[model samples]
Target chain A: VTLTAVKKAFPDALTNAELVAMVSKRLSQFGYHKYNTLLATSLCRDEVTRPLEQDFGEVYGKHFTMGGLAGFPFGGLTGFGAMAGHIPDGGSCLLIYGSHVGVSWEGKWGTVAGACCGSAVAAAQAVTQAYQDPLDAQQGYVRDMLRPYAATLSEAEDVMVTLPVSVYDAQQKLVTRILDEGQIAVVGGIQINTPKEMSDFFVVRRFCIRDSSGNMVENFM
Target chain B: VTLTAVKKAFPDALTNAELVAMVSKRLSQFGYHKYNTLLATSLCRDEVTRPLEQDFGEVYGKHFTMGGLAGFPFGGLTGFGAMAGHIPDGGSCLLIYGSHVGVSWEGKWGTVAGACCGSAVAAAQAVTQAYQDPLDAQQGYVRDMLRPYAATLSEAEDVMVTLPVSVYDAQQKLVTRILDEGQIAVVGGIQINTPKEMSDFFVVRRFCIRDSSGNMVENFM
Candidate 1:
C-alpha cells in the first residue's frame, strides 16, 4: 500500500514494525540506511505526539520568521537552520515525516549516521546551506556590534549573575535607537536566562544606555 | 457530573463545551479565568495525543537529571520552570490539566495572565524560587568566566559569527582544564542556532583553548 494510505491509517493498529518497513523503504529510495530512517522516524513520531509539540509549534508561529516551514523541528540545534531552506519562509510545517531528523548532535544516531547515506544526506545539505544563508543575517549584525567589547568586560565582576532584559531581534532597532540617543554603559558579561524568542543564548557583551554624563539608565543584561 | 469522570472519559464523544466547562470549573478553584483554561486544555489534548509527547518522556529518561520530574513540559518556556518545584523531581508529567499553563511568552496567555490570580500564582512563585535554584547554575559560572573579556572584544571584527564550542555546565571542568593547559581565546559573539538542551537560545563569549603562543586551534561557533 502507499505510504500515504499507511499514514492516513497511522496510530491505528499500525505497529512499529510496520512503520519501520514503510519508512525504511521510502527513505531507501533517497539512499538512507535502514538504521537512520528507523531512528529518525521513531523520534519524530514520539516528538510529534508530545504535549510540548503543540507549544513548539505555537512558539514558532508567534515568532514566525520569514521563509520558515511548519512541522520543521522548531527547536532543534544547527539542523534547524539547515532545514529552513528546503521549506518555504512562513510556510506551514512540513507534512513529511522526513522533516524531523538529521541534527548531528542529539544522539539520534540514525539521522547522524545515516546523514551521509540516502535521503538523509540531502537533509544535511539543506542545513549546511542554511548556515551560510541570509535568513538570519540580522543575528550577524548584532554580533558584529557586540564584538569589540569582549576583552574589557571579560573581567567584569558578577558578570555571571546578569541576564538580558530581552533578547528578541525585534529589539535590534531599539538597540540602534539607544546608541543614537544616550551615552552607552558597557557591562562585560554573558547574558543568562535569555527569553526563548532571542536567537542567541548568551551574549559576551551587554550594552546599557546612560544619560549623556554617563549614569546607567537601562540594562540589557 | 464530576471533572474526574469526564476526564477519565476524555476526548471520547466529548464536545469542546463539555470539556471547557469542566476545565474552567476546576481551574477556577485556583482563580484562573475560564477563558485561559479553555485555551490551554484544548492545546494539551491536541499535543498529548501526538507521537512526540511520548518521545519527550523518552528523551527525559535519556537525560535523567537528578531531582527532576518526568512528563514535565519538555519544550515549555516558562511554565515548565514554574511547575518544576511543586512536583517532585523525576515525577511523571503532572496529570492535572492546570499544570500545563503559565509561560507568558509562549502564548499560553491564559496561563500567564491568570498566574496572578489562581494556582498560577503559586506556579509563578515556584518559578521564582527555581530561578535561584541549581538547575541552571552552571550557566552562571560560564557567564562569569566570559564576562571579563567583553570590553576589549566589543569592536573585534567577525565577532558575531563566532559561536561557543559548548555551553553545558557539565563541561565547566573541561573549560577549567583548557584554561589551565593553555591561553584562552575570548571571542565576542552570541551563538546562533544553539542546541535545544542548552536551555538558552544563544550565548555570547565562547572560550577556546590555545597553546601559550596562541595559534587558533578551535572554533566554538
Candidate 2:
C-alpha cells in the first residue's frame, strides 16, 4: 500500500517533491497527523500507575496538577510522571517505554526485528479490514499478529509495534460505529506521532477513516 | 532558634537520636519533607510559561495542564524547569548544578577537584541563604558572629548550606499578609550566609527565593 501510494502520488516518484508526496500520503492514510484522546491517555495509564500511587499519597493530590500521580496521562498510566507541557490537552499525553527491537544477523535477534516490522505490516492490514466486524476483526488481528509477537517486545522501543496495534484496534471500533450510526465521524488519532513507521500509524488510524462527517473509505482502501 | 529547638526536641543533643531530631527539625522547617510531584512535571507551567510563550508564540489560552511546558508557575527566577519528588510533598527539590566558585584547593592543582568543589560550595551558599531565611533570628546571630570572618572561610566545603529559605519566605509572606499585617515580628538574618573571611562577599548576592504560590524572587541579599 505504501509503495502504491508512492507511485500514484508521483508517477515519476524519484525526486524529493514526489518523495514528500509519498511520505505525506502514507502518513495521511494512517491518521498520523490527528489525535486520539482516549488511546493517548489510556495507554500511558496502563504502564505507570502502580509505582506513583504506592510511593506518594495525598502529597500527589495536593501539589500536582498533571503528570504527578494525581494528574492525568502520567498519573493515569505509569507511576513515573511526565514533565509538564508533554501533552497539549494535558489529559491525552502518551509515553513510550524503553523496550526496543534488537537487530542482529540471526537467531532470536533477527526474529525480533521481523516481528516488529511485521506488526506495521499487520497494522496496514487492520486498517484495510476496518469495514468488517470492526471489533472482532481488530481483536482477531491483535491476537494473531500483535499478541503473538508481544512477547518479543517491551514497554520501551518495541512498543512502537504494541502501541500502534492498540491504537489501530481502537480506531477500527470507532470508525465502524461512526459508519453505522451516521454520527459525525470523530478523528481517532490526534497529537499522533509524525506518522513515520513508528508514530504515524496514529494518523492513519484517525484521519484515514473520517472526513467532514463522512468516512473516507475509498481513500483509505 | 534552631539550637533552641534542638535543645527542646532532644535535650542530650550529641547522641545520634538528638542529631536526627536536630536535622529533621531543620528539614521540616524548610519543607524538606515535601517533594511529591514528579520532577519533570511538578514545576512545569509554574516555571516555564514565559520562556515557552516567548519561544513558541502567544500562549494566552494555551493550557499547560499536562506538565512543565503546559502549565503555570512559568519559568522566571529559578533556573530549573522541573522539581524532583524525593521529599514528602514536592516542597523541596535539590538545586543540582556545576558552578565555578573561583579556584578551589583541588583546582589549584588542576585536578578539577577544585572546580567541582567550587561549584558545590557556591551551590551550598545559595542553599544556606535560602534555607536559613526562615529562622531569621538565628541566621542573624550567625551572620553577626561570622561577619568578621567572612573572608577567612574561602574554601568551598566551608560554605555549603542547606536550602528551604525560599520556601520559608513564601510561607512567611502568606502568614503575614493574613494574620499579622502590622504587628508582624519578622525573622531577621534567617536568609544570611555566615561570612567566611576567605570567600568573596559578592557571592552573597546569589540567592533564589520562591513563594508558596510558586512566585520567585531572586537577587543577592
Q: Give the top-scoring candidate (lDDT).
A: 2
What lDDT would each prediction earn against the true structure? 0.25, 0.26
lDDT of 2: 0.26
Residue B134 in candidate 1, Cα distance off native in Å = 33
Please state the error at residue B184 of candidate 1 in Å. 32
lDDT of 2 by residue, B1-221 (tens): 33343233224324223322433344344433322212121111222122222221121111122222211111111112112112233234322111111222222211111221222233335444544311111122223323333333333332322112222232233223322211001111111111122211011112233444544433223
lDDT of each residue in A81-161, candidate 2, tens digit only: 222223334232212111111122231221221333232334434444542311111123233433433433443353443
Candidate 2, fnat value?
A: 0.01
Which regions of candidate 2 fall more than 4 Å away from where they truly are?
A1-21, A25-218, B1-221
What is the overall TM-score of model 2 with all chains considered together? 0.22
True contacts kept of each: 0.00, 0.01
What does DockQ give for each predicted structure?
0.01, 0.02
For residue A3, model 1's alpha carbon misses the true position, in angstroms, by 20
Q: Candidate 1, A39: how far from true, in Å?
A: 4.9
What are the clash counts of all predictions, listed in order?
A: 67, 87
What is the lDDT, from 0 to 100, of the residue B206 in candidate 2? 23
